[PDB]
Design a protein around this nucleic acid. Sequence first.
RNA 1: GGCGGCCCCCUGGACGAAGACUGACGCUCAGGUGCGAAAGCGUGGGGAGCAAACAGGAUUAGAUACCCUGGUAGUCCACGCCGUAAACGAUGUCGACUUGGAGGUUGUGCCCUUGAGGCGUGGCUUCCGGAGCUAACGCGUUAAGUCGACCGCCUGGGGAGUACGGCCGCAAGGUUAAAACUCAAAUGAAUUGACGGGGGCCCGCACAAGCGGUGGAGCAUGUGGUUUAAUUCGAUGCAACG
RNA 2: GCCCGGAUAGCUCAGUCGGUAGAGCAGGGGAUUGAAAAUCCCCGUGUCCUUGGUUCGAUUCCGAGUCCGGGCACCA
RNA 3: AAAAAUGUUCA
RNA 4: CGCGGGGUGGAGCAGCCUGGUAGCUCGUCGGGCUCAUAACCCGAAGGUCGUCGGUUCAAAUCCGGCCCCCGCAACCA
RNA 5: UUGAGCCUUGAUGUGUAGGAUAGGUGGGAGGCUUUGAAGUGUGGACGCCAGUCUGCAUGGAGCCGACCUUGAAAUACCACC
Lengths: 51, 150, 117
Amino acid sequence: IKVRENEPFDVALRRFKRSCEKAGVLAEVRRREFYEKPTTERKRAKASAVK
Amino acid sequence: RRRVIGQRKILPDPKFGSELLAKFVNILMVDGKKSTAESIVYSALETLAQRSGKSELEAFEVALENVRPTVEVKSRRVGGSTYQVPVEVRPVRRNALAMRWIVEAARKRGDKSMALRLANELSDAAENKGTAVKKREDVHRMAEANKAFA
Amino acid sequence: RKQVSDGVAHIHASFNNTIVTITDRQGNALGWATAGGSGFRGSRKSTPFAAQVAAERCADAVKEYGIKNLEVMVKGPGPGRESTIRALNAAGFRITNITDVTPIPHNGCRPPKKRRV
RNA sequence: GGCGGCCCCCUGGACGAAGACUGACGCUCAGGUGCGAAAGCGUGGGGAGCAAACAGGAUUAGAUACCCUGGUAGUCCACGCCGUAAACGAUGUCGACUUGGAGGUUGUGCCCUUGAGGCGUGGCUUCCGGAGCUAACGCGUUAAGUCGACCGCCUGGGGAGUACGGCCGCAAGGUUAAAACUCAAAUGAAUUGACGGGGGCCCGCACAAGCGGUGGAGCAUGUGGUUUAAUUCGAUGCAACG
RNA sequence: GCCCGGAUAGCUCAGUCGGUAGAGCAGGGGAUUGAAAAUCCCCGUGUCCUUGGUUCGAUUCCGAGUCCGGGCACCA
RNA sequence: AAAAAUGUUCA
RNA sequence: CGCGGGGUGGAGCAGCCUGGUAGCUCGUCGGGCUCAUAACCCGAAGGUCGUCGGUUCAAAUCCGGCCCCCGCAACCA
RNA sequence: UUGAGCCUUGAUGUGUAGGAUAGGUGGGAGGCUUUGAAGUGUGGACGCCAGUCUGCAUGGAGCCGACCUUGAAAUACCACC
């Protein structure tokens, strides 16, 4: 991710990075792998689009 | 809880005109009774008056509102992860607590009477002989030097 | 002495330490500090708070050249990320960086298997 | 089965589109034959990181573990072998049919092309669900629906995928595959309640926050044990012990 | 047997060209307390080995005495 | 979001 | 037989070179926690120091007297 | 490139108090050395940062040590350690 800004601020509020964008952590491809259940979350998010 | 619970308001000391003086009789409450408490209050008050022709009330006030408590550690949830949160103390409850302490400190100084205690004891304002100096060296020692957050 | 004037600022914000290093325009070491030298326990030595104190301890030594500007290069997840910034700004030195370098790979070697706990 | 950087070289399949041709030449399939994730084994290299094994440190009463520090073979490469997996859509293969809905992807015909586009029609593919089917959970035109052709396997559990032998394997083992004896069930699905170091949600001296106690001492009293001719009997976690 | 170096608070060790004898640690005592701890504090005790002299203070500059340790002669 | 077992037979 | 090691609360082990003082770890013991208990928690007790005597102001202690126990050898032809 | 022995030319000199330039002894006490004016103000030095140390312009005019201050003595100044 890149959330840079100039002046003393250069990051974005965690809260509004949990809204209609998300951010909290960033070390995915530097910590251990898994494959079965990280991809199911997205499929459950097809049931997040059911109404 | 879900309500802030207190109780009735006590009356200000009526022959010196001062609520603080009346809340310190309460601290010294002996037999359950305010009476035998008020004696000694007044006895040691005079001791202080003799050495201090000016107000001897500002040697309670300074001493205890130099000391500004701030520390405990709790935890609450934030974004789906709980975190061990350090929590600040609100400036009002700092006050409320602090007034008590100094007068609590008596009946252990190994005197004969509460005269000799509370007299010599209370007179100091920043060079205390009471618990007020002795909590300073723990409150600021802790805080923001072994406390990771406000 | 050497009249640095822009000191490149390395920081590695590790979950187990936070290092601060004032390096030259050649990237050579000059001065440094960490929370662990500032001294607490053994595990208060990374905390955000600990990390503010540390950036300021470092700052004091290298005053004798005079620095006035920074090139902040953040590195590593681990905390006290913006705790250091505030110290820097607040210390006669000024942000002029616009893009940081963090090292991220295209990926070679295997990370540990780590704790199942 | 499985298969991810980039380029080249060598090479297969799939699909759609128009026609053109062949003229039932076909389908499945015991045996048999080929392919097989990962580990292992054999030959030969290579060694970054990780890491069986292994060695320390820690926790614990005990810790051949969960935890931390290291770390060897191995993982990688070249060659060969062994052939298993919850090798799963837990769903044999082939062919023919039967409501529909929305998405996805990929060919192709067309429309003021008059749009970034509008309408068809094929191939593949998720999600939904109707009838029907289902024990239920569900499956549902890519079926567990409705039909047919042909194969494989099953016939209570334990004993046991063990024994014996044959076959295969360098080995490890794999494959085929019992019986004696033993039990009254074993099994699937769903329903209610209870409980979860399951989740969400909410309060109470439940805790927090305070204040005063107890356990110490001596005495009062009960109680048990013990003792006595009897120490009448009952109470027993809260929910027995002035 | 000589030549070097040493002797400081309980422990362990600094260190003043001669203003003053301090640290770190363990212990105790306290805020303490996963029981107990582990976390956090605070000091304390002196020929500074024994003699003296320089001297308005000197382990503090130094002769000697005693005790100790390295290195060397390795001596009927 | 701070380690932790164990329950003789019989309605 | 002879060299040599050791007999310690109940156990496994210190103090015994060097004579005055019996400690450590473990259990045991009382009382808790718990619904009950391991775990866990706290507080006690407990040794003619293997025996028989010798010298001394002083003996588990040093030296002898037995008693097992345990160990190293039992020499070449 | 860089140690160590000398010089030569530079820099601190803290015994009780005195903030320090009181290492210590002897020499030693008023006005030109043509420089010593001082001050104002530029530069460098030190925790003796106070104090002095130490560069240059105006000033060839005249500093100012009994300092401040403590002490038993008091700091000019010249041998010199």
